[PDB]
Amino acid sequence: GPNICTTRGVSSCQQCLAVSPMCAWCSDEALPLGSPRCDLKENLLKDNCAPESIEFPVSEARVLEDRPLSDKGSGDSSQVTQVSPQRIALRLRPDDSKNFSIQVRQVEDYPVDIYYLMDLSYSMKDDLWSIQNLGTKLATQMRKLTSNLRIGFGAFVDKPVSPYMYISPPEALENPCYDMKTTCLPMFGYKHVLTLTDQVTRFNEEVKKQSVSRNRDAPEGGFDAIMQATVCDEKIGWRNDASHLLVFTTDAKTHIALDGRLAGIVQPNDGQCHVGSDNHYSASTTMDYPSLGLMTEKLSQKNINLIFAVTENVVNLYQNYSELIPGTTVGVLSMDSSNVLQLIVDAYGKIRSKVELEVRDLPEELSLSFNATCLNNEVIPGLKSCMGLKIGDTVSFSIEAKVRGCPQEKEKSFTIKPVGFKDSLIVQVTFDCDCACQAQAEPNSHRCNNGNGTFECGVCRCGPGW
Amino acid sequence: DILMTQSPSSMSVSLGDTVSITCHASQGISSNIGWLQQKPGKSFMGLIYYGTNLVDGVPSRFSGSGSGADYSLTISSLDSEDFADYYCVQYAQLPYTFGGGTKLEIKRADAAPTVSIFPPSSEQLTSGGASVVCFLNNFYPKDINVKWKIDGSERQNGVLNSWTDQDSKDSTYSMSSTLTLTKDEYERHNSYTCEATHKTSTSPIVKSFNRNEC
């Protein structure tokens, strides 16, 4: 019987396919006048339509790259696969949809970078003493989780400028502890100490040479250091294919963007690296503290997982900041940093306990829907993230792409990538809105109103200019 | 301590005059000096602070100057109320220290003193004491010297002197000298004299009496 394909009364093969994904078109010559050439594929073959002249695109989804998920992230020069498949080809006709899957594995034994960014203001004097063996003790514990560990170290106090800095008498500049009965270092904003290395005794010996400085106000300049440790890739030494842990330890409030005006500093933070060969942050006295949004932008761009390891008196503060910098972790640091080792191990587990999908470069006319399968084959519709995962766990997502109408560009591509993951799924989309018989049309056809029209797909169309 | 040498100790001047009081410090005090006024039998009033700055409500005829260790208070065209005591005070260092002071006195023409001597009263002698009183009234200038003589010989022990401030009306000074003896000692002698030595005369003004005799 009559359906939406015929009752619409289309004028060409292209208009026929744009009615519904179920419609088809017959380009055959020997077709009755009263018989419509835009109907179901079953009705056309039922009306003696030549099978070769049947235009019927079917939306499909084939894989082009389907490397297996790796069982170990160790070894290789990062030939590791954490996302499968890696590339699929998608074909969609107007107003149609097609489904496909993606698998994501939190691979076992994946390399890890840990940069220790330590508050070295005067309040952290005892904390230095208790982390003197951390490099080797941390290597012992992380050896169970990864066989590719690199650690490094940096330190911060605050902007070495009045009023944060004591500037009288002249003796106080060389030794901010002069008016007490001790010596401490001249004030420094941020200094890089140890580039990420797998030689963990370098950590122990660098830390054993470190000492604290002293400044005037309680909020310190650690956010300056988080920025520099993030955007000075080469100097800090982050590896391309590794989890990046930035461990930020402090016991105090922090300075934030627009605080610097109390030191006459109004220039916004530029988010660029300013740590030269002397390993100190040279813009500390000329550039404002960074804002949370700017920090987030750089941490996300360098795939840095920031860990707030702070004391109980400021845990709530940093947990509240952590909610404004998504992906950040908080751990409770003891007053002498004596528990920082287990704090790092717990945070690393928490970081690798989540798989959240992200979509990049999705065309306007395309819309996606997700069904998540976490834990044990338990499907959770309308969800694109899993939690409570362990190292080695594998999750999957069912994805359906629905196109609205037909776009001008017939070939676009977008990406499905888990947050913080190296690998990704590239979906190459093709929009099949045309008919093969159009590529063999007949402009100024003798069959169409004395050359005033074009003959294509077995019908006459008004030519250009009408 | 910083010593403040204030000069002069006194000056006899007139209405409308322009006078200057200097103050010299034992070391530099870089204008950390104040000037004070004390009207007769009254409290103090601030005049100048930090060398040159008038205290609120002080007439502009007062002015301060100087630097280093030498400063000056200058009153242009003196007024009647301006006749009073003036002091300088440094606050460059602790402890704060003051000057010796300066008294502005009214100037007038010289005037010899009127000397009057008074033997002991009857009531006093009956009690056992004997006081010879000598008044020296309405003289100018203030520089005067008194001398007591018992039987022509000078007497110094037992003398009690007292002076008045410059009189409001005639701008003169007056003095009271009292010689006190016992009734017994007062009767061992006959002649009692007080001599006044002023610049208005080369010879001292003499006044005396004789006991018993009258």
Add this chain to the structure above:
Amino acid sequence: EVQLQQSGAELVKPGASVKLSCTASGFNIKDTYVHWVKQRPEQGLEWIGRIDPANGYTKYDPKFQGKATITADTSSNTAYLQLSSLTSEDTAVYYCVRPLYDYYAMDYWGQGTSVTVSSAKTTAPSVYPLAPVCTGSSVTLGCLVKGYFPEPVTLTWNSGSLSSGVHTFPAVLQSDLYTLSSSVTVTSSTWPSQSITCNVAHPASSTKVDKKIEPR
């Protein structure tokens, strides 16, 4: 208007103690430094010390260390000067001082509090008439007030009727007792023609004796 109102005159014995007060009027005592200054006729003006009433911190001239203790009560807007182990040389006038603008200046002064340290008991004066000896056109009489304590004494002639031409001299300390005298001059036709009397009052002992001058 800034005014520093000091306590009434004090009359104490040697070895005792006294506490002078200086109450702020028209301003908060807490605003500025408050100094204490001592004044004697011979020795002049001596700075005792200062206090910051906001916090209680004091400074002293080492000369006065041990004798002077400066305190302040912001509640009652008053500053104090306590003197201990009093002696004769502690007899003086004491002023409280504060600056106008300059933190370190000495601009506003209280009226001063007189302190007299003596063992003397309240003794009534002996009033003696002073008649001249046995001539001119002007005649001078006198009145001698001897051996009284403490000050003051009011002296008039004819119960304040005779005023012009009179010289009452400042009292002088004669061995823990005061002595004062007064002269008066008129014309020879007035005395002994008209009766002249010396009116002396010593309210401390509540005595108002009067001696008429009689010739010899």
Add this chain to the structure above:
Amino acid sequence: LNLDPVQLTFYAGPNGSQFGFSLDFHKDSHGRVAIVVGAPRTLGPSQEETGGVFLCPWRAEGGQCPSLLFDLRDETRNVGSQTLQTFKARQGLGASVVSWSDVIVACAPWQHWNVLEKTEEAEKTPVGSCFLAQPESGRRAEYSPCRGNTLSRIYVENDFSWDKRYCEAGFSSVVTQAGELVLGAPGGYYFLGLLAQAPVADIFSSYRPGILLWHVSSQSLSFDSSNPEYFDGYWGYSVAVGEFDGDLNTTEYVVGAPTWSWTLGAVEILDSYYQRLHRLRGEQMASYFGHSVAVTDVNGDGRHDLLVGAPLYMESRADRKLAEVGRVYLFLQPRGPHALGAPSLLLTGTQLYGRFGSAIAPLGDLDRDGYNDIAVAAPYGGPSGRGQVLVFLGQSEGLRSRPSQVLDSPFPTGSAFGFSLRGAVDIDDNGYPDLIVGAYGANQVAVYRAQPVVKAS
């Protein structure tokens, strides 16, 4: 709506002087309007940055301005067995300027101060200082309420109570109609923030050069606190005045404290005795709620309304992501004695990192419809990030939520166009209030003249 963006007027200062960091309109004793411009990095005598002030006569062509001269020499006074020292290097003279009557107040918030006594000292710290000028007469005065003479040891022994050593007095400033200068000092009381108020007349009559430490008896400072909610709150980062208690004899203070309560931020309304009438809490930590405050009646009911800028507010966007754009809050004052409620309106920036709300200027009634209007600066906004000022018109319900007009920076990148704003004064005497916009990064000031409306909105 009807500011003319075609024919602007440009004033310019020396390169690197940050000319335009602060500005205000100034009327001389004859009512002739000029522009006072602070240039906080102007070079001084020793070829060292000290700051400076310029007094720009109104000219349609703009150009260069004469200096308003202040003593730029460091001072030393040996008095009371102590050494008082002022340090004017990098003091930032002109980091704030304000005009009242025929008096200009220009402040140097980072002027340093120290007191030496034998081997001890007070510590060389930025107490700040303000300089006062009467241009027509040449009179000069200073006001530095946080200078003290207490030694470092005493503050330590007393746990830093009443510690005014880092005030930075003059960081922000305002003058009441009666003539009371009110200074914001975000570093006062060990970075709590304090306010210092004193009559302009009394500042002049009690000042003498060279004293360095003098009393201003009619001055009134705000109070210290042991409450950690106020620690590092920078109370006084911004200041304003207005009428918020219904009694027209009292003047109320509006104080911004953008890091109050662990960087939540707050704005407080106080009486002249610094008793708290209202507190508005920030919405989001680190947004710098209270960075800027403005007082003006926007809905024509006679009651002053409050505007608060939070230039670092991060707006919520798709996929659980935040975007720093800045936000402005409007609080309409209710009838009679009642609390300021929730905001009546939220204005949110659109350009990432634009810092919408960094400055808020009352414009008066720009389009002459009977409702006062405002200008909001996004100093790094606009599609190019060069800076942008957006005009919002008043209406009976508050403000219009969409801007009636947008002023794109005429200066190059980095000029910080909009960082300082002032409106509500008719500088060309055409009957419409005008707008001056500072761009200290370009060392310039732009004057936007209001013109008759093309057709009304």
